[PDB]
Design a protein around this nucleic acid. Structure first.
Lengths: 129, 124
DNA sequence: TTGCCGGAGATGGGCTCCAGTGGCCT
DNA sequence: AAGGCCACTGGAGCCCATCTCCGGCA
């Protein structure tokens, strides 16, 4: 999705990098989630279910903790991250997979934004699925 | 820029009067702020401030953006400038500066520049 | 009784504005 | 020398995306 080596090695879709691309902004919760998801080192608290753009919060409290760090908001927690996700519902960005705790799914066209398929990305992260 | 509700906005600038107007109206008609927000495509936060200012003021006019407050042009200092000119109507701008320093009205930092002091004369 | 949904005042980020200020020139 | 011209500022208000507290409903 980029020519130059606009900075290397680790996570596939660095939020800091996607901000500069996809429109702009001071990092948005959903962008945060995409980043963590494209980072093998994070696959123990959050990850792809294997089904399309759907994912799971293996450790919501750990995901939360991190989110807080990114936004410099020490008081963050699952309660608030959750409602955050709940806020995305009618903006057609994130939807919650009924009958399952901690599992959600991006519903915007990430393929158009990311330039990859679910499976494409999945492979690159070595998705157990 | 485009917000997450789908609205069109100009980062930094007030919501157009025609819309702030509609916001108040719908609320008047009984529409719930969350609906207005979701409908008129405006961040509930914004709808919130607007409605609140209207209920508290009666206006839809956003606050006055921009400007600054005086730094060197201190109230007293502004007067001293009037006193000096009144005493001697032809004393030069740089002479007023020395008199402000000599009487310790201003420091070697507080002291208003010539341009500024002549600006004070002109505008006062 | 835990679990999820959603309303709305409070926050501070990036941004546009502009009175205010101090050089520079003539 | 006082006025014309003016780049440069910082702090204010602006909408936006949450943050945050909490009532509803199941």
């Amino acid at each position: 999705r980029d020519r130059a080596d606009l900075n290397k090695d680790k996570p596939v879709i660095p939020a800091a990098a996607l901000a500069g691309y996809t429109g702009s902004g001071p990092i948005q919760l959903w962008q945060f989630l995409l980043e963590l998801l494209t980072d093998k080192s994070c696959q123990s608290f959050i990850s792809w279910t294997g089904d399309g753009w759907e994912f799971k919060l293996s450790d919501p409290d750990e995901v939360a903790r991190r989110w807080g760090k990114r936004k410099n908001k020490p008081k963050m927690n699952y309660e608030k991250l959750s409602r955050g996700l709940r806020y995305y519902y009618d903006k057609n960005i994130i939807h919650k997979t009924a009958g399952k705790r901690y599992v959600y799914r991006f519903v915007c066209d990430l393929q158009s934004l990311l330039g990859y398929t679910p499976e494409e990305l999945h492979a690159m992260l070595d998705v157990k699925p | 820029g485009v917000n997450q509700l789908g609205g069109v906005f100009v980062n930094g600038r007030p919501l157009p009067d025609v819309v702030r107007q509609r916001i108040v109206e719908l609320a008047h008609q009984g529409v719930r702020p969350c609906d207005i927000s979701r409908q008129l495509r405006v961040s509930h936060g914004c709808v919130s401030k607007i409605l609140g200012r209207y209920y508290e003021t009666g206006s839809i006019k956003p606050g006055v953006i921009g400007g600054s407050k005086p730094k060197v042009a201190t109230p007293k200092v502004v007067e001293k400038i009037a006193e000096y000119k009144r005493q001697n109507p032809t004393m030069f701008a740089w002479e007023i500066r020395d008199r402000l320093l000599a009487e310790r009205v201003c420091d070697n930092d507080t002291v208003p520049s010539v341009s500024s002091i002549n600006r004070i004369i002109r505008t006062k």
